[PDB]
Amino acid sequence: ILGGREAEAHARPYMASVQLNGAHLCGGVLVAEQWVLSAAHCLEDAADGKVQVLLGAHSLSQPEPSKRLYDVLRAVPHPDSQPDTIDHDLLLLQLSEKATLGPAVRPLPWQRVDRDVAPGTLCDVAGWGIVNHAGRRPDSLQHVLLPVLDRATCNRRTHHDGAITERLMCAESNRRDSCKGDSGGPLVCGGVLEGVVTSGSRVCGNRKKPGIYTRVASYAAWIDSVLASA
Ligand SMILES: N[C@H](CO)c1cccc(-c2cccc(COc3ccccc3CC(=O)O)c2)c1
Numbered sequence: 001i002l003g004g005r006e007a008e009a010h011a012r013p014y015m016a017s018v019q020l021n022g023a024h025l026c027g028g029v030l031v032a033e034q035w036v037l038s039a040a041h042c043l044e045d046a047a048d049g050k051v052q053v054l055l056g057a058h059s060l061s062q063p064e065p066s067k068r069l070y071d072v073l074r075a076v077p078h079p080d081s082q083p084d085t086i087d088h089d090l091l092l093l094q095l096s097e098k099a100t101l102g103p104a105v106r107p108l109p110w111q112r113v114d115r116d117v118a119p120g121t122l123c124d125v126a127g128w129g130i131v132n133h134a135g136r137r138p139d140s141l142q143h144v145l146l147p148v149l150d151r152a153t154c155n156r157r158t159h160h161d162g163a164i165t166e167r168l169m170c171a172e173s174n175r176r177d178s179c180k181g182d183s184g185g186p187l188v189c190g191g192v193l194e195g196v197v198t199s200g201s202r203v204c205g206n207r208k209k210p211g212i213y214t215r216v217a218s219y220a221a222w223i224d225s226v227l228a229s230a
Contacts, residue, residue: 001125001126001127001129001131001138001142001143001144001177001178001179001182002130002131002132002133002144002175002176002177002178002179002204002205003144003175003176003177003205004125004131004142004143004144004176005142005143005144006138006140006141006142007058007126007140007141007142007143009058009064009140009141010056010058010066010103010104012124012126012141012143012186012188013030013056013102013103013104013105013106014029014030014031014106014107014108014186014193015027015028015029015030015057015126015141015185015186016028016029016030016036016038016053016054016055017053017054017057017060017128018036018038018042018051018052018053018054018093018184019051019052019053019054019069020043020046020049020050020051021049021050022050022052024054024060024128024137024181025042025046025181026038026039026042026181026182026183026184026185027126027127027128027129027181027182027183027184027185027186027197028053028093028184028185029108029110029184029185029186029193029196030055030099030105030106030107030108031107031108031110031193031223031227032107032227033098033099033101033107034094034095034097034098034099035092035093035094035095035226035227036053036092036093036095037090037091037092037093037110037184037193037196037216037223038090038091038092038093038183038184038185038196039089039090039091039183039184039196039197039198039199039214040077040078040081040088040089040090040091041081041083041084041089041183041198041199042091042183042184043075043077043091044083050071051072051075051093052069052070052071052072053069053070053072053093053095054067054068054069054070055067055068055070055099055105056068056102056104056105057141058140058141059139059140060128060139060140061139062139064104066102066103066104066105068099068100068105070095070096070097070099071095071096072093072094072095072096073094073095073096074093074094075091075092075093075094076091076092076093076094076226077090077091078090078091078219078222079222086163086168086198086199086200086212087165087167087168088167088214088219089183089196089198089199089214090196090214090219090222090223091184092223092226092227108186108188108192108193109191109192109193110192110193110216110217110223111192111193111194111215111216111217112217112220113217114215114217114218114220115217116151116169116215117148117169117189117194118148119147119148119149119150119153120147120148121147121148121189122145122146122147122189123145123146123147123148123171123187123188123189123194123195124143124144124145124146124186124187124188124189125143125144125145125146125171125178125182125185125186125187125188125197125211126141126142126143126185126186126188127141127142127143127178127181127182127185127197128140128141128142128181128182129142129178129179129180129181129182129183129185130179130180130181130204133204133205135180137181144176144177144178145176146171146172146173146176146177146178146187146211147171147172148169148170148171148189149170149171149172149210150170151164151166151168151169151170153170154170154210158208159208159209159210160200160201160209160210160212164212166215166218167214167215167218167219168198168212168213168214168215169187169194169195169212169213169215170210170211170212170213171187171195171210171211171213172207172210172211173204173205173206173207173209173210173211174205174207175205176205177204177205177211178197178204178211178213179204179205180199180202180204182197183197183198183199184196184197185197187213193216194213194215194216194217195213195214195215195216196213196214196216197211197213198212198213198214199212200212
């Protein structure tokens with residue numbers, strides 16, 4: 001997260017750290033007791049290593065009573081996802097067991113009504129992604145409120161030139177933005193999950209290259225089907 005600030009500890013109980021061999025790789029969102037939603041590209045160059053999900057965390061390195069690292073029993077990338085493509089970049093991770101719920105661990109309700117979030121709406125993005133262009137990795141969870149950018153503006157030749165489908169949404173990227181290590185994490189509007197961070201053009205903090213977020217509402221049928229297949 002560039003241009004953000006340290007989040008209040010455990011104020012986002014749905015926030016997950018998807019990890020590879022003990023290291024934070026991507027953000028994730030707890031959407032059900034045993035399921036974490038993330039981005040499919042996160043596990044592309046991982047196939048070998050131990051994939052785990054850290055729940056109830058503020059600090060990545062420090063002990064906290066609510067912190068718990070879970071093993072993943074199965075990884076469900078969206079069937080239409082392709083590598084190094086920004087479309088259908090969703091991943092569902094089944095935990096080893098149902099997560100112990102409490103004030104610091106709680107699933108987030110997600111948008112099921114397939115209608116765009118109004119442009120200008122301030123939405124909260126959180127993550128353990130890089131906090132400056134030099135690549136400084138924060139130990140503690142960061143967040144930033146970003147305004148939603150209309151698809152038309154986002155799709156201009158000067159911006160993402162037609163790449164923003166109806167299944168994607170954009171947020172302003174001027175200084176404040178999501179960056180490397182934030183994909184798979186949440187974009188929350190009025191307490192509801194609206195988007196999942198994707199890597200876009202892999203450029204951060206540049207107003208001409210807005211942040212790209214996968215609209216969860218567009219994938220309601222797939223998420224429901226995966227969550228129902230215990
Ligand atoms: N705001 C912009 C566009 O929305 C944005 C948001 C989020 C990430 C990036 C971004 C910037 C540089 C390099 C990478 C490659 O990262 C990975 C590559 C492989 C696995 C995991 C990651 C981690 C990750 O994807 O976060 C991503 C850019």
